[PDB]
Amino acid sequence: IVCHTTATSPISAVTCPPGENLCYRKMWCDAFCSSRGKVVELGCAATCPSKKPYEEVTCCSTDKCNPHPKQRPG
Numbered sequence: 001i002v003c004h005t006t007a008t009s010p011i012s013a014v015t016c017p018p019g020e021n022l023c024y025r026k027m028w029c030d031a032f033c034s035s036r037g038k039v040v041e042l043g044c045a046a047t048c049p050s051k052k053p054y055e056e057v058t059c060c061s062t063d064k065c066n067p068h069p070k071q072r073p074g
Contacts, residue, residue, distance in 0.1 A: 002063040004042040011068045016044030023066035024048060028055040042068050 003023030005014045016023070026041040026049060043049070043066075048059035058073075060066055067073065 001044075001061060001065075003044040004064060004066045004068060005044065006040065006042040006068075011042055013064050014044065019046055020044040021046050022048060022059045022061050023064070024057050024059040025066045025068065026050055026055055026057045027069065040069065042066055 001015075001017055001020055001023060002013050003016045003020065004011060004025070008014070022045055024041075024043055024045065026039075026043060028039050030037040030039050048057055050057065058066060
């Protein structure tokens, strides 16, 4: 599956299958977001990662399904 990565500038879709059935945007507030930062991580994994109770880990199993906020959720 092709998934969006934050590992590239600008944030881009990468073909991840070997250890990846899912795409995710793992987005959470660090300090007060709207002013003081949001940790938005666009990645690939076979699993929905790091603590989704507080992290908006919008996991999905399709090509380009995890958009960086601006792209579709904003």
